[PDB]
Amino acid sequence: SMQLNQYTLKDEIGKGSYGVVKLAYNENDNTYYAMKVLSKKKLIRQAGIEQVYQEIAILKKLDHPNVVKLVEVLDDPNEDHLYMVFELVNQGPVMEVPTLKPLSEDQARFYFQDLIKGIEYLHYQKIIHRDIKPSNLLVGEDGHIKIADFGVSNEFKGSDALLSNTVGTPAFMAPESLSETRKIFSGKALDVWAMGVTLYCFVFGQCPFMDERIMCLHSKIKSQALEFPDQPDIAEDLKDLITRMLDKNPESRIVVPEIKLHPWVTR
Numbered sequence: 001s002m003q004l005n006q007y008t009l010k011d012e013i014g015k016g017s018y019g020v021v022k023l024a025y026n027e028n029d030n031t032y033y034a035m036k037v038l039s040k041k042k043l044i045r046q047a048g049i050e051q052v053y054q055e056i057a058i059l060k061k062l063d064h065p066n067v068v069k070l071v072e073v074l075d076d077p078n079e080d081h082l083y084m085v086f087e088l089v090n091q092g093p094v095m096e097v098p099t100l101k102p103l104s105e106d107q108a109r110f111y112f113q114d115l116i117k118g119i120e121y122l123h124y125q126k127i128i129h130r131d132i133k134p135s136n137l138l139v140g141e142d143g144h145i146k147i148a149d150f151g152v153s154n155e156f157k158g159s160d161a162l163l164s165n166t167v168g169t170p171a172f173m174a175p176e177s178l179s180e181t182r183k184i185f186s187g188k189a190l191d192v193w194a195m196g197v198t199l200y201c202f203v204f205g206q207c208p209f210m211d212e213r214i215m216c217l218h219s220k221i222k223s224q225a226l227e228f229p230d231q232p233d234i235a236e237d238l239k240d241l242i243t244r245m246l247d248k249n250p251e252s253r254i255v256v257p258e259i260k261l262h263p264w265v266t267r
């Protein structure tokens, strides 16, 4: 281990888009935390950052039981490393895709309900997450999920983010974002698409559009019809919900307030 003020830093527990997350013991309050560690110089060289202080500003806005909680930032202006202490969500990611053990419909519904609550909250606070996927959804001791990894999240003003391009994990990126043609698209509808991909993963253990070849992956996202396998056989109302979330037209894609009242969600 190593010491950092009142914190004993221990094993690496995860690695998100940026930096690493360590288990950390706080000797002052005898409690464990999760600590994200970033190198300022390394982030600079990755650019070829004020983005980090934007992530911090966003996380300081958020207080919701289905979202991770930032508790402290340790940032010495004469040190390379920045440290963000979060509350520990001890059971870790809900799922890593691909997996041989998908969730049952009932368990998927439970976690999807948590995800809806977290996302509506984010969007109410004018945050788009932009990297919704099962490996970013952490299960707490209480059995509920918390949305994590705000490293590519964005704050907008007004009613929606007007994006000309976006950052995300390719398999979870909506078709409107993968065009080779200058455009503008809704930030919120991107998160919905990714929620759809995530729900599909929950019950099938794989993404609905996949290819090892990035160009074919993009092509499938934009132009391949959504298909469900023969097993596991899932309810028709769940197929309907996923089908509406993975509407390739963001203009007609189902929106969060409608997802919450969808019959699959409310049963």
Ligand SMILES: O=C(O)c1ccc(-c2c[nH]c3ncc(-c4ccccc4)cc23)cc1C1CCCC1
Pocket: 013, 014, 015, 016, 017, 018, 021, 034, 036, 068, 086, 087, 088, 089, 090, 091, 092, 093, 135, 136, 138, 148, 149, 150, 151
């Ligand atoms: O990179 C990030 O911005 C980031 C920041 C904080 C956490 C986090 C806050 N509390 C936590 N409790 C637990 C765990 C955890 C535990 C076990 C296994 C994996 C993760 C992670 C966390 C997680 C991340 C990402 C990297 C791993 C998944 C998302």
